[PDB]
Design a protein around this ligand. Sequence first.
Ligand SMILES: NC(=[NH2+])NCCC[C@H](N)C(=O)O
Length: 238
Amino acid sequence: ALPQTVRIGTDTTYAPFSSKDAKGEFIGFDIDLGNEMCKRMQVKCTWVASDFDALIPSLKAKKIDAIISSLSITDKRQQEIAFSDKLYAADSRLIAAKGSPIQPTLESLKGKHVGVLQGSTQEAYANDNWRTKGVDVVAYANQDLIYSDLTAGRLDAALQDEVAASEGFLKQPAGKEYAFAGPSVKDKKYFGDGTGVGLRKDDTELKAAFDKALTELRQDGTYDKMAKKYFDFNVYGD
Ligand SMILES: NC(=[NH2+])NCCC[C@H](N)C(=O)O
């Protein structure tokens, strides 16, 4: 009993995983993966754009049926929703201006303005660890706003997924003067283990269909054909 049309929510301001092209078509690695999996599930799929923090609310209220949006699989989120198997890995890392002394440490960040996406694992981490101790942590409605304010000099740093900052900003014209500030911030408690399709806890049939399709496209080498369009390293981790 899978629906005829599976409605998939995503936030299109997180290139190279999810954004929109010049005509306003959805593009990116999350979109490619979702469409391949729908093709193997033999369902029809509609993509529904949303703000990142509205995705899990819309899922719970049945306005969409699945979330593919670099949604990290964390212990907190599993208390609310279910997840497919891992689609790819996702570490977190700070970016600041090139030459910045900034490190991902309280002592370095106290009194700085750090941008984080509202609803993200990074907002959770920064609020507990940094906002309480005097770092000016600013939550943003979407990631594009964060990159804008950083280049505007309104932010000193921004915490987001590492590959999104890399491919989506630092290797782009806009990010030429910026760089990663320190190594990735590892914290198992906050950042989870890779990303997956978020689904309602009771939609086990739909979880099984996505997992079967993900295993099939990984097995035959499709995942890697698709990943190579965007990455030259192994995005899956392993
Ligand atoms: N399309 C997006 N905005 N994705 C943001 C993902 C950020 C982080 N991985 C999280 O799960 O909270």
